[PDB]
Design a protein around this ligand. Structure first.
Ligand SMILES: Nc1ncnc2c1ncn2[C@@H]1O[C@H](COP(=O)(O)OP(=O)(O)NP(=O)(O)O)[C@@H](O)[C@H]1O
Ligand SMILES: Nc1ncnc2c1ncn2[C@@H]1O[C@H](COP(=O)(O)OP(=O)(O)NP(=O)(O)O)[C@@H](O)[C@H]1O
Ligand SMILES: [Mg+2]
Ligand SMILES: [Mg+2]
Lengths: 440, 447, 440, 447
DNA sequence: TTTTTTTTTT
């Protein structure tokens, strides 16, 4: 089959570049040398780009001279071909439209070539599984989507930013929320400082092991799921889904987790758990993935799948950042952490969803006399601090000091809040129920 | 070209369904009639599904009669073809694998057809823009992804987790395990907090040298072996198997370890040891691999081999983690510890067996005024605290303080317990027999 | 000529694997894919290994499907060939013997190929010397012998452990060895505790070179040689043959080493040296072969070479164990010393020789406040604290402390001892003649 | 194929034996009749051996008569063939090399025949197991190695090493004659441990920049030149010969080098320098080559040239090895350093002269709290430690620490000494004259 | 070789 191309549009673009050099910027922004169908056209555009990068004006004589210097004058068709191309183009008024048509043709041919590669891989598995071929096809499709999504980037005037800002301000003012700007946390004090879980925010609640960090994250997930209808997504890499469900049942029904774990439960608590399960089946918005060692690309694919199937995602829960595995940057832990944080922040900005990702800390907290967590106390910190916008720290003096009077009191200390002042929220922790409640 | 198909696997599936009707459910869950390459095979599977939904058993005569009544007997090839299909298939033991093969072939053919459609759309835009074709291709790829490893495998859901949780809770309530849901530790106090050795748990018993850490681990192994029939696996990397067995005989027969080490044993203790050996040969559930510096891959291979041979593994014993060596991450000890911990937790989740991994402590324990071991006092903890769920620390103030009143009292402090609160279980240690027993003295409070 | 192969045995093995999957472990232990003569059989066994490692049962249909997915179904002969192979094999009862025959054929073909390579090297020297050709031939034959190895590990049954333990108990109790059990060490305290130089043992003394450790090993060699005529071997990496000989003469003759080195002409020392060398000639088992810069695999090869020469090794003296520095592990010496110790223990079990090494510690022995050889004084601790079966540490406080607390009671502290009580073994040392005596 | 042989070398050997009978001993020691490829050559060598053992001189006529009496004259080719063999050989000066070539050819032919036998045994096991064939191959290769056992050998056995022991005792009886066994260093303490500069020794004196390494090397050169008459050779690659001469004049005349460099010198020090120059012109045993970037081949050629012209070389000075450049191994510095060290060691063994080869250090020394240099601290270490025998390191704590009490005290620490115990030689450094002298202060007992 | 920045531990 003949590949879809428009050689006449390429000739018009090249002739307009020969005539006009001010509209060269539009052509350079729109298309590249690879977008031209014929290889001589690619060479011509490459020579034009090299001349314009040097600051030389784009004319027939200098272009032919440069092609002869590189020996490419004879390969492209000769100087007579260049003169014919210069003659053919009347004007460059619609050269942007011609470049758009050329880019359309190039994208279509790229899609056709990728489809041919997919068909070849299908006919020749070469020992690959179906999942590998599916992942390769999805990767190629996303590569084409990224290649087409390149015209969005561009420096815009302050007027457009002002119009978007005043439109958003009018939208916010016309929509009554009573302090609930983001997803409702279920805690009154948290809904005053943070004013809800804002979308496209990296929520970092890092704490020590056996501090109720997973428990508090689960409580936040439960409160959000009860206070919203948008489906949530849980990635419990470390904790099994069975333990997560047991903790959820203990927290929501206010029943001791020990009796649930042993299974020694009375029929009244059984009925309470049954009612909680009925409420959950009424919601059916929770999807817990217990797989561990997942790259952020897989997490992004799963999030896109759930958002496409279920109409967006209310919340994305991550077990903690120190359990995520990237084969590419597995050599250095800090580089891996930075890449994971960057990918998760890009995903959160992409789908406009608050992502609750926990983390661990460092031993220096125990080294300090005061065991209040700081930014440097975070395990492999820095890029975590930079990429995230809402970082909190769980503090429990009851754990450190047996004589502490803060027993039951958990201090969620906001390590970082870009929009708004940071603080410390006191809550009531029930170890038996594993329930975090508003402290009176 | 020729579409990728496996007619032989389809014939094997059809013959196995004609022979075996109990494995129909796996075939129905895995594949449908559309997964069959040939249209007669689609007809055959459709008729099989129709007969099975009616409750009719799947045999040759009833299927032939049903195809004759619908007139599809000649469409599928005839009764002789069906008889040939029934004859060719030897057994239906691997019919699940054949169904997986058919599903793979159908998925690849679907992918090829979708690629052909996308190429046709590319060559013929039909007025659609690039964005329209891209969205169509994305929709087709998403449909294929929804037709392969979709929620039928259950990657992430709520209702399935609820059903599994309520089934487990009902099973635990009906089971008269009486507190000990996991593998029995042989210690009543330990069976109250930890509720026995739960499967897929990384058990960390950390102690200073000469604290009877390996002694207590072997006591737990002996208690589990006497309280279960599932075979255990011991990796005595640090100590030789001779010393381990001598300590085991001293603990079980309650004979002085020094006398055994000198060999000067009377005939009464000799008869007690012989009876213990007879009990062990009755069990024969203990396999000790005293190879040192083992990679976790070798340990995983040995565990899979033993589980295949002896029908699972009850317990996995590891003799202190810093002896285990990973040549890939031998450059940095913390990376080695993290890799070992991750691989051991993956193995514990894989085979559903409680892994008892011992560990050492830090020198900061001597530096602090209170010598009770904490999580940070672990010898290069790192991911040890994160991956494990049953971290414990042996405390012997008798060793630290000569004037301590806790002589024989060894305090096992639970550093981390994910499910349940933490505490301190005191036990009676007998250094002569090297025996840890339940403390029957005054019940001190876990402060 | 036709290479020696048994295709029928290969067909029987493949058909038995198709019939029986339980005996797959025996075939995997016995042979590999390379042992199959024909390349299609190699591909078939490779596909079988890939299927069984995935957990899939090995049958005809799945194997054919996997070969078709990899495209190797047409290469091996087609599905009909596989069906014929499955049909031909009656049973898998004797598949172990068939696999042994296949392994024998593969080893014989390997030997034939190696002989052809040696003949080619002989015909075309390519500038190599005859010594190079001989070393290459020895290396090739050693590689064949190493490839002719078998299973070395495995979780032992409880019955075997019980038998070994009761044998050890009977050895400790019944046997009236009265101190010495193996080769006599010479030191009375070492005679009691270490029970002599036990064959197939790893005795590593960790101290400073030319600081009493070298003469300690020399006295060990002398005492071993005075009570047996078994050929002992010298592998001193510290001092040459002449200097070691001078040290040995000074130690045995009780003559000041200043007179041994700097010639003080007298007939009393000459008569003592004459008597010493007469006793040495009476023993007639000291074969000098000291060198520098080797690996314990080379030491094992030389042990086999000496066993070919004479047969039986009484003692190997490894002076300056830190002179085998591998540049890859020269910085962190702990792992290198651990690997060397493990290979030396393997060599000791191989030829039944009490392998004794002289590990070098750090300068902190004279610098740290803890003058005794503790983990700070040990070379990055690690392999000096553990691994080695007999890690003796020479606390010679004479060198460490100017006003020594140990003069004639210098402590041979044993960190780990398989047979004998650990502790500080105080021994007398004569600095004048470089002679280590035995303190009561 | 054709077996590898050199008939021409055999003919040269036979002709040289026919001409020269004094070199028969070397031929008998090296080769036998079996090393001759042709059977007539074997017969000829057998007759030659029989005649020489009988005491008969080896000439053409007597050998022809001896072959005629045994009837082997016709078997070897006749008298004309023997006359041709006697005619063809010009001289027997290189008959030892010809015998070595013949022995090499015989060894290769024996190896080929053994390989043929082993391949024949491999193709036809004749009931032998794989272990039997392996042991047979090992025995055959060991027999080939045993054919040259007296040639390829290392340390000797008990009786031979005892004879070497008593011989060395008799030799070291003569050792207390001067104390210095090699070239006198001029330093009493250095002449105790090292016993002077031993010939065929690679002396690596490595230090930090501006540590007096070149200064101390020049002091050693001056001491050797004043204590010997054999000519020395200096390769001042780093510094020009002008600075070298200024340092030499400052050291020998004990005048400040700063005043010499500025030229502001009094007439008394001028007369001292003139007397020193008169002493040097009396000696005239110093030859400096200040060219930089020189290959070891050029250095070896110049050394052989000087040894031929001036009757050997007393000392070879190299101004630090990393300045030496090899165009072939310029891609990798470590390979270049190893090649340079190997070539210099080969040259030192060739001419039997101690070579003064300086070296630089690494920056890991300043990283360490104790700045005492070690063997691994050497710049591009490894092969340097292997090839050299007299490695020393200069330590000056006065440079590192301003409050150090070792001002003027420079410690030469021996890192490697194959023949002798290593130690720390303290010296007194005079920066003004740049003079290294024996440390006359209180001796420090090295802890 | 060089050169940065993170954890852990002694
Ligand atoms: N039945 C119970 N009674 C009392 N306390 C309990 C009970 N069950 C759980 N807990 C407590 O709940 C907390 C669980 O904390 P958790 O969030 O699991 O730690 P974590 O930080 O998430 N683990 P990790 O993220 O891997 O470091 C601990 O403080 C337990 O003591
Ligand atoms: N007139 C002087 N007065 C005092 N000190 C001096 C004088 N002249 C030289 N020095 C010292 O002498 C030393 C010169 O040593 P020198 O041997 O040239 O260094 P180097 O080892 O060759 N450098 P490098 O080759 O990079 O290792 C330095 O410590 C100078 O400070
Ligand atoms: Mg958690
Ligand atoms: Mg210099």
């Amino acid at each position: 089959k003949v590949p879809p191309h428009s050689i006449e549009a390429e000739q018009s673009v090249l002739g307009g570049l020969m005539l006009d050099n001010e509209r060269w910027d539009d052509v350079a922004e729109r298309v590249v040398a690879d977008d031209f169908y014929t290889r001589p056209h690619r060479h011509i555009f490459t020579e034009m780009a090299r001349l314009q990068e040097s600051g030389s004006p784009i004319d027939l004589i200098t272009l032919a001279e440069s092609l002869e210097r590189q020996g490419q004058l004879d390969s492209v068709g000769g100087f007579a071909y260049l003169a014919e191309l210069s003659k053919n183009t009347p004007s460059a008024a619609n050269i942007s439209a011609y470049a758009d048509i050329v880019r359309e043709r190039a994208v279509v041919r790229e899609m056709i070539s990728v489809a041919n590669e997919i068909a070849e891989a299908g006919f020749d598995p070469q020992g690959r599984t179906s999942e590998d071929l599916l992942d390769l096809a999805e990767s190629r499709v996303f590569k084409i989507a990224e290649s087409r999504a390149n015209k969005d980037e561009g420096p815009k005037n302050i007027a457009d930013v002002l119009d978007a800002t005043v439109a958003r301000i009018e939208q916010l003012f016309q929509q009554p929320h009573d302090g609930v700007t983001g997803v409702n946390t279920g805690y009154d004090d948290l809904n005053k400082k943070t004013a809800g879980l804002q979308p496209s925010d990296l929520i970092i609640v890092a704490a020590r092991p056996s501090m109720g960090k997973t428990t508090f994250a689960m409580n936040l997930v439960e409160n959000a799921a009860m206070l919203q209808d948008k489906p949530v997504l849980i990635f419990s890499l470390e904790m099994p889904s069975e333990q997560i469900m047991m903790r959820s049942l203990a927290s929501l029904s206010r029943v001791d987790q020990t009796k649930i774990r042993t299974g020694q439960l009375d029929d009244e608590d059984w009925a309470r758990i049954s009612g909680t399960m009925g409420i959950l089946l009424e919601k059916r918005n929770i999807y817990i993935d217990d797989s561990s060692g997942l790259t952020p690309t897989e997490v992004r694919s799963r999030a896109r799948r759930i958002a496409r199937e279920h109409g967006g995602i209310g919340l994305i829960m991550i077990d903690y950042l120190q359990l995520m595995r990237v084969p590419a940057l597995s050599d250095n832990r800090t580089l891996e952490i930075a890449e994971i944080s960057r990918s998760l922040k890009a995903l959160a900005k992409e789908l406009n969803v608050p992502v609750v990702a926990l983390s661990q800390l460092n031993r220096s907290l125990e080294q300090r006399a005061d065991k209040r967590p700081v930014n440097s106390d975070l395990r492999e910190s820095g890029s975590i601090e930079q990429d995230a916008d809402l970082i909190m720290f769980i503090y429990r003096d009851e754990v450190y000091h047996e004589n502490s009077d803060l027993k039951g009191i958990a201090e969620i200390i906001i390590g970082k809040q870009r929009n708004g002042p940071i603080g410390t929220v006191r809550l009531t922790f029930n170890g038996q129920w594993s329930r975090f409640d508003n402290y009176a």
